[PDB]
Design a protein around this ligand. Structure first.
Ligand code: OX8
Ligand code: OX8
Ligand code: OX8
Ligand code: FE
Length: 677
């Protein structure tokens, strides 16, 4: 059993029935007064999904183009909140613990994942520090109690190759002890000249039942990315328009092949202890330690040379980083009745402690011709080194009551947080030391009709430490999100279909803002995001699987000192939609064959905060072919072929500014072989 900290749903095709993302305790999606999406293991594979970021490319309210084709980090823009989008990821109930103010942001390979859960809007009441768009919860693969052995191989264009294996099963005659061990190797060239991606990772897991009342799960995850692909951008001039009559290629490398390194070693171990006391009382401890090394050498373009017609000015960034982080979550849940009301009452205490030691170097590099470049002129003019030790501590105390009474489903949550953040400029010897406490709350109400219709309303709050500091060097007040949400959910009790609509209004406060004149920030900015999401998961037969989505997002700087009080953030499409279908032939000559694909639409986005032109809209097509050769008498063998961006469209996915625009991925074609023993 054991609802606390577990999804416990069911899954069929692309549709999950339950999640714990919104509650830290298993709850049907239909009875949860929040917007929750679930991306199934099957959805990841069918779409040939290569990262967490890309796996959401079919999910409403999520923009997946912040840095275009780059795969170095998972940038998850939620409900138009692009800033700190790298810090939205949770793994097995615990904040991932990257430091978004450094290069040490972690990435979880999808091959280790069983599910991806997406919670929209402010959600600090259960998690502490987080962004106003929502958050993403990855659920790792766990030991199975029956033997499972899979081997997979993939090959593609762009020099892609990959190997994985996934073995699981019980170790004891009684099936109280089970393991899973997963490993993988991969490599890629990318559309971009002279770039490599490469990764090696292994994940051991051990599960032990001390009895029916107690389970301990032991986890390891060790990952080495000796190369980091491409993580650059080029000027809008001449990507979005011609530059002296020519266009920059989508394969252009703005760096120096002799000085382009990204080495990230991420080492994690942890455990989850599950103890049932009573049919009433349950307790859980989730724990994870992280230790990572990141090494970076990057020459990048930054604007056009003022003197040399078709050359870009270039600069150099260098970094060596060591990140350490501890996270524990202590949960105690009471399940009990009080007359007609059934209560699910949760109390928790969590603790985050992080230290990041960063030695940064920078300088000026030679200009580079943006059309027919000559590489090799790699001398750097160094700027002053900039060395820091960064520390963060977060202690949270939270309370939640899920109250079900007749057809009502209510949610009440409160959390008090103590945050301490410090930054020792180790070059200068100075230290910024700041302590804060924040109170956050959430209240939800949903009415469940007996046909599977569920209207609901939600109010929810969030906070995040401010990345900026004021006229005295003291960091500003944490930013704050507040959200009103209205929704409607529908599942016909027969069907394997599910439909939702969500209407949202998010206000974000204490955003840093200053007049262009000034060098100092004040916490007087405000941002508002409002809109509508529609999501459809259908099975119209036991062969035909559907997904669809529509997103309308109106985000605006409602208060700014910098001239921008009235503008729309860049990297924030007003309109998005997507649709994916998969058809499996199940009897007859074609049996064992599967066919699939889909299309996703992103509306225009602004290239800059100043709003001076648009990044055009784009429509991409995906397609798939699978064949289970077991149907030809070799059981456990299946093969598939995938193509994303099937029409090979050449587009800018987005721009962070007028200097930095990113290309979308060209067609990515994959062939996969899966064999179970
Ligand atoms: O370590 C760093 C920041 C991290 C970074 O920049 N990465 O690229 C790594 C990925 C983490 C976040 C994704 N990027 C952003 O959120 C854009 C940040 C931005 O606007 N800047 O100007 C840069 C910040 C100035 C200091 C530069 N040094
Ligand atoms: O140069 C720095 C510090 C180094 C750094 O932060 N790097 O990422 C490495 C080099 C950036 C190259 C372009 N990177 C992108 O366009 C992705 C977004 C991003 O990462 N930014 O930092 C946005 C601003 C980058 C310019 C200002 N800051
Ligand atoms: O304002 C700051 C700190 C805030 C920050 O880092 N932002 O990104 C603010 C978001 C608006 C700017 C969008 N992007 C760019 O201008 C490109 C690279 C970048 O991001 N820079 O900051 C380098 C610009 C120098 C600005 C001075 N430093
Ligand atoms: Fe950067």
């Amino acid at each position: 059993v054991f609802a606390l900290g577990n999804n416990l749903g069911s899954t069929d095709g692309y549709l999950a029935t339950h999640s714990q993302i919104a509650t830290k305790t298993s709850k049907p999606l239909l009875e949860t007064s929040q917007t929750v999406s679930v991306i199934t293991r099957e959805q990841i594979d069918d779409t040939a999904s290569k990262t967490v970021q890309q796996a959401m490319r079919y999910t409403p309210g999520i923009f997946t183009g912040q840095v275009g084709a780059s795969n170095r980090y998972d940038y998850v823009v939620m409900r138009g909140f692009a800033d700190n989008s790298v810090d939205n990821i949770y793994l097995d109930g615990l904040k991932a613990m990257g430091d978004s103010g450094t290069f040490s942001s972690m990435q979880v390979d999808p091959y280790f994942l069983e599910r991806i859960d997406v919670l929209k809007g402010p959600s600090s009441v259960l998690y502490g520090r987080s962004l106003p768009g929502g958050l993403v919860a990855l659920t790792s693969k766990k030991p199975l109690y029956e033997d499972y052995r899979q081997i997979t191989g993939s090959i593609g264009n762009m020099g892609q190759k990959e190997m994985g294996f996934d073995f699981s099963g019980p170790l004891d005659e009684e099936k109280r002890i089970a393991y899973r061990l997963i490993g993988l190797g991969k490599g890629s060239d990318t559309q971009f000249d002279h770039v490599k991606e490469e990764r090696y990772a292994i994940a051991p897991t051990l599960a032990i039942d001390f009895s029916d009342d107690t389970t301990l799960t032991l986890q390891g995850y060790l990952q080495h990315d000796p190369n980091g692909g491409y993580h650059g951008g080029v000027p809008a001039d001449g990507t979005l328009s011609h530059h002296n009559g020519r266009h920059i290629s989508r394969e252009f490398f703005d760096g120096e092949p002799s000085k382009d390194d990204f080495d990230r070693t991420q080492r994690m171990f942890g455990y989850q202890l599950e103890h049932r006391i009573d049919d009433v009382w349950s307790a859980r401890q989730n724990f994870r330690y992280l230790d990572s090394d990141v090494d970076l050498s990057q020459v990048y373009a930054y604007g056009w040379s003022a003197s040399e017609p078709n050359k870009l000015n270039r600069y150099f960034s260098g970094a060596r980083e060591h990140l350490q982080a501890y996270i524990v979550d202590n949960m105690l849940q009471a399940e009990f009745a009080t007359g007609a009301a059934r209560h699910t009452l949760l109390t928790g205490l969590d603790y985050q402690r992080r230290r990041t030691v960063v030695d940064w170097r920078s300088g000026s590099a030679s200009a580079l011709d943006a059309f027919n470049p000559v590489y090799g002129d790699d001398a750097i003019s160094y700027f002053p080194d900039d060395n820091h030790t960064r520390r963060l501590e977060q202690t949270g105390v939270y309370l939640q009551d899920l109250i079900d009474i007749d057809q009502w489903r209510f949610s009440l949550g409160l959390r008090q947080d103590w945050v301490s953040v410090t930054d020792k400029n180790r070059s200068t010897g100075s230290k910024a030391d700041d302590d804060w406490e924040k109170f956050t709350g959430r209240i939800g109400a949903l009415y469940l009709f007996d046909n599977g219709l569920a209207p609901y309303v939600s109010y929810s709050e969030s906070f995040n430490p401010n990345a900026y500091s004021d006229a005295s060097g003291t960091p500003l007040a944490p930013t704050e999100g507040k959200q009103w949400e209205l929704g409607l959910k529908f599942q016909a009790p027969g069907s394997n279909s599910f439909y939702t609509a969500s209407l949202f209004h998010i206000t974000q406060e204490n955003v840093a803002s200053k007049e262009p004149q000034d060098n100092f920030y004040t916490s007087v900015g405000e941002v508002r995001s409002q809109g509508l999401e529609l999501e459809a998961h259908t099975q119209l037969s036991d062969n035909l699987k559907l997904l669809g989505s529509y997103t309308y997002t109106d985000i605006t700087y409602t208060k700014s000192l910098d001239g921008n009080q009235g503008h729309t953030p860049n990297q924030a499409p007003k309109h998005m939609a997507s649709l994916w279908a998969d058809y499996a032939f199940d009897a007859g000559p074609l049996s064992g064959l599967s066919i699939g694909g889909g299309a996703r639409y992103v509306g225009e986005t602004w290239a800059d905060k100043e709003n001076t032109l648009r990044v055009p809209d784009y429509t991409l097509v995906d397609a798939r072919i699978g064949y289970d050769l077991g149907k030809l008498g070799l059981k456990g063998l299946d093969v598939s072929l995938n193509a994303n961006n099937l029409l090979d469209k050449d587009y800018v996915a987005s721009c962070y500014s007028l200097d930095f625009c990113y290309f979308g991925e060209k067609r990515n074609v994959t062939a996969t072989v899966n064999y179970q023993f």
